[PDB]
């Protein structure tokens, strides 16, 4: 069954995004990005099921902070992502992966929309583009994100 | 996401059926149609609304009356049929859509079996047939009704 393939890809892209976000962490601040957004048209509110429910309108650095620990907590959750073959994937696993991937996407969009200038200065566009292309190919082949969620980068996605 | 497409069609056909039945409702009476039926072999009893459980044996005018109010009530339910892009479809939506379409089919079946004579008088044979063809082609493509339910019009369905 497809669970292991989806699992390793979810982990792999998770690693890539933090690396990519890491190169521009100095350019993403409270003043530059008072909120989590992907252009004027797209703002995102954070809400993890265990700690924070009613979504918080917060800055981009913090949302991603909330986001990355949240995803990682699931990756370190043996009951969700088995480190042993003798532990099955939970029945709701697929649903969990989609939510992770859905929120991870928002990090690409913010980087593209607000900080592409800093990426170009570092001559790091190929890495972002390569990571993004591979990511989009992954989620589209398995419909892991709804079309509406992908709205902020639709034109870019079409060129690929 | 497939859900928005299914939504409009469910709405689309709901509108068509009420219109078509509207043309012959006076010829569908308790005296003409003491029970809701689709040929001698097929009678239907109203239930699975949470108001009425024990399926009730009633006339076609009333069955169709109970049905359309019930269906219409669901369409006006924002939690079931989102009027907003920011509101997701409920998890059970697809299941909800199928029940509606399944019973809406029964109105087609009843009209064909018991009221085709008045339809031809109204020169509405093409309209009923066009609506039904679109209806059946829609429901088959997405398996929204189990074929066992489609028995009353199987011969007709094959010719289209």
């Amino acid at each position: 069954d497809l669970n292991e393939w989806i699992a390793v890809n979810t982990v792999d892209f998770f690693n890539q995004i933090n690396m990519l976000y890491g190169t521009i962490t100095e350019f993403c601040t409270e003043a530059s990005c008072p909120v989590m957004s992907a252009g004027p048209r797209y703002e995102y509110h954070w809400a993890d099921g265990t700690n924070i429910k009613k979504p918080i309108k917060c800055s981009a650095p913090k949302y991603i902070d909330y986001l990355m620990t949240w995803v990682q907590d699931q990756l370190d959750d043996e009951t969700l992502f088995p480190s042993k073959i003798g532990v099955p994937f939970p029945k709701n696993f697929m649903s969990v992966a989609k939510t992770i991937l859905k929120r991870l996407f928002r990090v690409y969009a913010h980087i593209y929309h607000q900080h592409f200038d800093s990426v170009m200065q570092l001559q790091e566009e190929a890495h972002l583009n390569t990571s993004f292309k591979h990511f989009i190919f992954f989620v589209q082949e398995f419909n892991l994100i709804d079309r509406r969620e992908l709205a902020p980068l639709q034109e870019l996605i079409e060129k690929l | 996401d497939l859900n928005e497409w299914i939504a409009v069609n469910t709405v689309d056909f709901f509108n068509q059926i009420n219109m078509l039945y509207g043309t012959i409702t006076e010829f569908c009476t308790e005296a003409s149609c003491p029970v809701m039926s689709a040929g001698p072999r097929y009678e239907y009893h109203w239930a699975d609304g949470t108001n009425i459980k024990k399926p009730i044996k009633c006339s076609a005018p009333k069955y169709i009356d109970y049905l359309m109010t019930w269906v219409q009530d669901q369409l006006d339910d924002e939690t079931l049929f989102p009027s907003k892009i920011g509101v997701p479809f409920p998890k059970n939506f697809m299941s909800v859509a199928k029940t509606i379409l399944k019973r809406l089919f029964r109105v087609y079946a009843h009209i064909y079996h018991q009221h085709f004579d008045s339809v031809m008088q109204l020169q509405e044979e093409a309209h009923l047939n066009t609506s039904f063809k679109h209806f059946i082609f829609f429901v088959q493509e997405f398996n929204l009704i189990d074929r066992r339910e489609l028995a009353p019009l199987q011969e007709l369905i094959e010719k289209l």
Binding site: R41, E43, H45, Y112, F116, E125, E149, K159 | I85, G86
Partner: peptide
């Protein structure tokens, strides 16, 4: 979760 209301697409 998300609620509605491009200088990189020139590169492509």
């Amino acid at each position: 979760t998300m609620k509605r209301n491009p200088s990189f697409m020139d590169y492509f």
